[PDB]
Amino acid sequence: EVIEIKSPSNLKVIGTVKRMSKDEVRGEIEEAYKGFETISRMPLYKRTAILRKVSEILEREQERLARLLAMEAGKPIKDSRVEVMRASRLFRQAAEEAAIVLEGKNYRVDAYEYPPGNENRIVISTREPIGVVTAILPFNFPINSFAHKVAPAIAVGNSVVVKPSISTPLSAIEMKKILVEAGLPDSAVRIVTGYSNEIGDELITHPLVGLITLTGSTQTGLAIASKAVSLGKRIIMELGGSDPIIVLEDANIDRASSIAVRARYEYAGQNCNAGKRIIVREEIYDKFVKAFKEKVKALKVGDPLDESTDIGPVINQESVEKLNKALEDAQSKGGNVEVLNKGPETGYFFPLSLVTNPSLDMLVLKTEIFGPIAPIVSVKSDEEAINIANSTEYGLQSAIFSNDVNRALKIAKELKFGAIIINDSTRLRWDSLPFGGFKKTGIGREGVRDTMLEMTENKLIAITLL
Amino acid sequence: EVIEIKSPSNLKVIGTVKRMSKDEVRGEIEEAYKGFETISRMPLYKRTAILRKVSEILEREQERLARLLAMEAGKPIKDSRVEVMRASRLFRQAAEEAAIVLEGKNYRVDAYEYPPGNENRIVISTREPIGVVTAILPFNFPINSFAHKVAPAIAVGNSVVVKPSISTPLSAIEMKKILVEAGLPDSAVRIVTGYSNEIGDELITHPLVGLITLTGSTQTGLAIASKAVSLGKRIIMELGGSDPIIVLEDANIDRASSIAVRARYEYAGQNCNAGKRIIVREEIYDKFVKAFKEKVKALKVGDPLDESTDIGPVINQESVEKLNKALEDAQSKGGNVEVLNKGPETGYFFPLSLVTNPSLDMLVLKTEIFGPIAPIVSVKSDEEAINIANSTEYGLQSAIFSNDVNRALKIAKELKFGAIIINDSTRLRWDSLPFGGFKKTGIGREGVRDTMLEMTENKLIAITLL
Amino acid sequence: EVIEIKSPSNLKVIGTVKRMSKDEVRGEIEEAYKGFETISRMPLYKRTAILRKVSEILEREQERLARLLAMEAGKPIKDSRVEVMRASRLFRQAAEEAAIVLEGKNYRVDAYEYPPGNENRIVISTREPIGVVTAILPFNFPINSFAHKVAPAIAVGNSVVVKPSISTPLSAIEMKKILVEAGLPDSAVRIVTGYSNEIGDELITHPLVGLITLTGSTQTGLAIASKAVSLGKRIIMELGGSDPIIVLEDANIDRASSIAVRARYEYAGQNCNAGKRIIVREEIYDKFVKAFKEKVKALKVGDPLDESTDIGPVINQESVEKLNKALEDAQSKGGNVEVLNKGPETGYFFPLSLVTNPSLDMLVLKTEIFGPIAPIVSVKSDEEAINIANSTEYGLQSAIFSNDVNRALKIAKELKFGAIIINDSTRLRWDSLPFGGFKKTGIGREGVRDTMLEMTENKLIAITLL
Amino acid sequence: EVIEIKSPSNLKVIGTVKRMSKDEVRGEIEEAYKGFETISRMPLYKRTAILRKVSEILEREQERLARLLAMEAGKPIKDSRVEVMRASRLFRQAAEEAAIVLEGKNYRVDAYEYPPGNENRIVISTREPIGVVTAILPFNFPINSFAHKVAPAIAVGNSVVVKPSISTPLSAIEMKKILVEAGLPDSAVRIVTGYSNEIGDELITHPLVGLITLTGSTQTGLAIASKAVSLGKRIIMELGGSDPIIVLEDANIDRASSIAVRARYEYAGQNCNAGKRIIVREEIYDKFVKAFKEKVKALKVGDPLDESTDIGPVINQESVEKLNKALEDAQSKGGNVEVLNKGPETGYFFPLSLVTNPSLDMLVLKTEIFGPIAPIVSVKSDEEAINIANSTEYGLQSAIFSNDVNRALKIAKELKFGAIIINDSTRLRWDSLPFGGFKKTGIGREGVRDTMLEMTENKLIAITLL
């Protein structure tokens, strides 16, 4: 009847959520449809007024929401603060950008001979809401993935059924209360909690669901997307990354090693755009690896509520097990695994780990490692840096470190990624800008402007003047 | 081994095409991948010079391509000429608009606090080709659906594997020779012919296929889309419609009935945006229905190659049987089926037919009728017009006839369609503008501008200036 | 040494401002240049944070600023409230729209064969601030014209020297204090007060002034613009209107007469887009004129601080004199002048007045009447409605009243105005949208989006990759 | 009465043109107004078909038009061919881009509270032609400045009165016959020839002239602009530049000196964006200056019609005298004037000359030198490079040579220019892209896209739905 939510730090019970049946989730979708009929009939200015009010509340509750993220998600408080502050600015940017993002066209159809009589026509476009959006959240950004999916949906007039990860659902429940305090109709966003195997399918198959937006793994996402699309439903998918960091021989080693450490091990490596594969020109390999090792041993692994904590635990036992499979696989294939930093024995603390002499047939170079394992590969050439970088089924983001920007811009043309970052982190994202990638990183882009267009239908009106 | 192509007018043999095996189609996708590697490395001005040359060749070969359409597709020569002129114009519009449509951004990232240090960044976007496109064409616009899929793909640097309908593949083989004459590398577009059930699956599941664009039936499309998306491939779908024409009591009756007749019966009704359901205000019902019948009986049904033919045959026996079943279903459910006009008995001529007293349980009101059957419904109010109009699983285009545009524009707001046409045909399309709609009418939009965006990936480059 | 500001309602002294010398204004411009060096180096996000803070303060001070407008400008409190609330929303829209409005391009220069080698180039654009803006305000919107000129200038990084009308300078002084409270650097906006004949020229000719934005009369504006442009300075000019209201025989007479009364006599007619010339089809002339007369006699002319006041005085004796010249001119040429409504004898109350049988050689039909004089012209045809409407050197906005929107859209193609309003007021303006006109209405457009582009220089950066 | 056109190469008579009176130019503006009334009523697809035909004729007549440019303008045939190909491409780009550039908006007015009732409004924008354009052409690009002014004007529906430079009017008379051959009405473009001081003022002040677009000198332009704006006419101005080339210590010296030579001396230096001031880092000064001199002495100065000529004459005696005065001024102020290369003594050949040890008081550093005189300055730092670069009243384009793009991009931020070129020539222009700059370099931008917007008026239509 309820599910217990435990801190991955100390396994203490943080709160509980309803264990929903298929039937109760069917009811939440029918209620979200009525919420669509309400919110879609409100003028845009009242909807953006609600979004600006949510923005201000999120700033006022920053510290409370950050502590909650630290407890359920194991995200160090300093990183938890940043996520809540991004969600605040995202809700505001959705308010601010709606007028221009949703703006239609008056087409110059007299430019075209077909159909005949275009000189007597007015043809305009508008962006219409789709209806009910199913939003399936990842565990790792429970407040900011909420904002990415819900802020745009409200701006355009859609309702949302939100299914947070059962690992981190309490954030989503507190976000709903903030939406109601901001003046959002109770029916316009419905939180559903439960096990994926009981409530997953109804959220994807119900005839009243117009669209499914999902952040999660490639395996889980592509199956769900396939089902959604089979019933004529629209899909936005932000799936895995194995983002490479390329360090060229003319790199600033101090900067590149500092940013690599932070990019790989922030939130114990549980980022879609963490620096997951490190590719270093042989000329600087030993200097880079020594600087990297020093910086990883200097991090504080411990309680995420502590101000001095750099790194917390991974989310659960399932993740610990997957990460051990990965370290075993790598030792069994000639990899040099080194444990660099160990946290308390209280929960799901995973040792900050380095793999040297990795090979392309290892789990650490061919799958998404959502944990604090840094594989570092030596290369001889830019060409070999490019091939190893592209050698994954992923294509989210990639970083190049070089004092030679002309050279980095030329390598960037040959990297198959949705973003290339020159002299900065794979972790960089702008919540208003396109985010996403090529290949199996997902489908569409997610960001306030692109999400609003992906969440609306273009509608033309053509008048023939008589 | 070959497949015989027969005219639906007189059943005579027009030509043959290779019955390709799975292994031969595998070869074509491999060669198309080499075509991608070639075409993607040419500068855009060279690709656009190829597209302007195709445009000029299409204009020069117009009468020869029009006659071939008439013979394989049964499309009257007058409508065949219009189709080849549209494809001419589309190839040119892809050349002309590519510079502006593919234009990227220089983002004002210094407007945003996150990530910190945006005042020191340049973030630019470019549109990158996806790679190999699988284009699955419908029978009803063999040349213009070719143009809609191939011209944007060449503009953006994708290669294409083209599977025409086995009913109308001869057009596509003639389009390939025109591409080669225009200077396109032979590897850059590959025509596959054969049975949908022997070569369909390779074209959807081959690892080298990045995207599937398809025009066809809802059931066919959604199954293909489902499979493609399960493998991480992008999809553009233009599936059916059941476009309603709403005729209000204050319409111009002569104009509304003339356009409603052309809208339903053009190409024997085989158009995604045919006027498939006609909703008439009871005040003018008798006058409209009477004007409608006189004009249907004035249409000439006959041989597509005769200059005085208005209406040719339907495409094959399978269609005749689907269309009898819709007629029989209407008779049995209280519908009055009246035949108005009958062409020769020599192939797949289907009588131009009218159904009065239809009901929402009938096939002629709840499915796409891809043939010359016009159901006419009487309504008392605009509210009733809107509820019948919206009652389908489709959402392509709708028309409203009314001398009152103010009322037409308010009704427009409540119609769930990709386009609403005020005082003109459901048939209207602007080949550069979005075409498509809501619900199971498809995924995405198809037009020179929209197809180019859907056929490219956004790629960010972010420089942090040191 | 000081200039006294008097209420046009009761001539009571409301406040005083410095009588500035050429020398002191030279000093204000040199200080605004230093303000440019400061504000242009602040990141955009801090500038938009200042603009959002100004937005909130203007809401908090709405009633105080509205009373001040009522006292110095003679604007009834209810209209004064609306102006302050528009200035609030304008300062916010400038904050909200900057990121997207200022966004540059990444040009697809490989679309072009010239110059040769475009396949090896990156070409981007950015919007740069111009430097120091001279802003010359009208008397009639002292707070909202302030916002139109200052909010965009701050968003883009320009400094502003603001010269309010000597009729209404106290508003501008209170706006500066609100800018400082919001965190704007003291040097970034300088208020100058004085007589045009002492300080006018320095504000237009100083070498440090990059741009002049002016709302005012055509005669004053075109002289200033000529001087600015002679020294290579940019210009935005919002000058006069004589906006026509066209009432067709199928108009809603009740609505058209109500909106005409309000459009002509709001703020005693002192609006650039007041309904200044009324054009009525003869078939409804007597019904319209009787409805108009009734509604004008029912208005309350009196103290603008009173809640029940509809109409206040004109601004000064100079205006009273110009309006008498106009009424004398019209009586002397066969016009039927009728006084409909008289206010107190305390100040510059001008009688609400109607002229019937006007002719095209009268001041009331050929010049801007910035006072409560309504000329009404009878016409026989749409063609005569169009010729009389276009028969002025102005082209700001024009309104058509008709239940036939198809007909009004066709008349709209032949009206030489920057905006045509169908079934609504000439007074309509959207502060984010283009506002302005053809002919001698001015130069450029004024609105948050267009003003930001007019206040920035496009800058290209072209990199040839080596 | 006629004016003799003489070749600046050998002073021989190339042709004659009418010496038009004020009364004859009055007639031409009247006929152009009738041309506006005709061309503005044609649908856009017809006007664009005329522009694509002009493009094809220019390509066919390329060698004949190139030879005429060589003879009247003294422009070497190799550079003349490039000019006629650019104009060919520009006419085509005006045809191709008109549909998207002129596209209006459907504003989301329901995002705004003011005016009340925006939820019931449709507000659309269109681009309307202004009417008659006066195009005043410079001598140095007689055919491409024609294209830049006439092709956008025809695309948007304006008529044009074209006053070519009396030095190079024969090209424009040949362009008119091509327009007529393309199908343009004869009334739609009117060539005026005569003395600037007899017909200049009618072309600027006639009441039927809506806009003046001019390429020429700063002093000429600003006086004309001043007059036009005093009468309420719109203005586009492209006036001088003194583009600096900055060459950093880590530049490719061979490339920087080759491009710097071409940049300064192409067409004897008579380009708005010539490399007019060359700023070299003291570390490479001696090596650059030496490579520079060898390449200048390798250039062939001679007859424009010879295929091996690199550099022809300057345009007339007035130019030779302006250029001697700049030389004499430099000698007297401590400058070392070295002649490097001398063409024939047969017309207006001017020696290719170099000035070392220049000073900021010299004409060769504070004015536009429209001839083959290259001042080279030594600098110690980037800070000094930037201050010299920015020291002019001009702001057209600047170039930076550097293998370090990161440093090139940071310097780019501090240069006050309309475009900065990294590792390429100041000569670069993209005829579709903005061209122009800051300060007294002009008003507005000139390119297919920008010129079309500057040559149209925004017109809003706002419907309130009853």
Ligand SMILES: Nc1ncnc2c1ncn2[C@@H]1O[C@H](COP(=O)(O)OP(=O)(O)OC[C@H]2OC[C@H](O)[C@@H]2O)[C@@H](O)[C@H]1OP(=O)(O)O
């Ligand atoms: N069958 C089914 N039906 C419906 N919903 C389902 C289903 N299976 C899983 N889910 C939910 O999808 C979400 C993502 O889960 P997962 O793929 O494990 O991703 P993570 O949360 O681990 O995040 C990893 C990704 O985030 C960032 C990057 O994209 C990484 O690859 C989460 O809310 C899951 O619920 P559950 O309650 O958690 O099981």
Ligand SMILES: Nc1ncnc2c1ncn2[C@@H]1O[C@H](COP(=O)(O)OP(=O)(O)OC[C@H]2OC[C@H](O)[C@@H]2O)[C@@H](O)[C@H]1OP(=O)(O)O
């Ligand atoms: N020579 C000179 N130099 C500098 N500044 C000068 C000069 N002459 C006037 N002005 C100022 O221009 C502004 C507009 O004045 P005006 O043209 O009388 O317009 P109104 O204020 O009456 O507003 C009418 C217009 O507003 C709306 C519509 O566009 C109407 O036509 C005002 O601040 C004037 O100062 P001053 O102190 O007021 O004399």
Ligand SMILES: Nc1ncnc2c1ncn2[C@@H]1O[C@H](COP(=O)(O)OP(=O)(O)O)[C@@H](O)[C@H]1OP(=O)(O)O
């Ligand atoms: N399983 C499958 N795999 C691939 N293509 C398929 C397919 N089923 C159908 N198609 C193609 O899908 C396209 C559209 O068929 P359709 O029946 O959905 O629509 P239509 O009648 O409008 O052409 C055709 O090219 C069809 O091939 P055939 O016409 O030769 O049958």
Ligand SMILES: Nc1ncnc2c1ncn2[C@@H]1O[C@H](COP(=O)(O)OP(=O)(O)O)[C@@H](O)[C@H]1OP(=O)(O)O
């Ligand atoms: N007062 C005036 N009125 C109109 N046009 C004028 C003018 N003064 C100069 N022009 C024109 O302005 C154009 C540019 O002249 P310019 O000396 O400013 O520049 P350039 O040397 O680059 O051609 C020419 O067409 C010139 O006519 P002439 O070349 O026949 O002299």
Ligand code: NA
């Ligand atoms: Na990746």
Ligand code: NA
């Ligand atoms: Na439909």
Ligand code: NA
């Ligand atoms: Na007007």
Ligand code: NA
């Ligand atoms: Na310059």
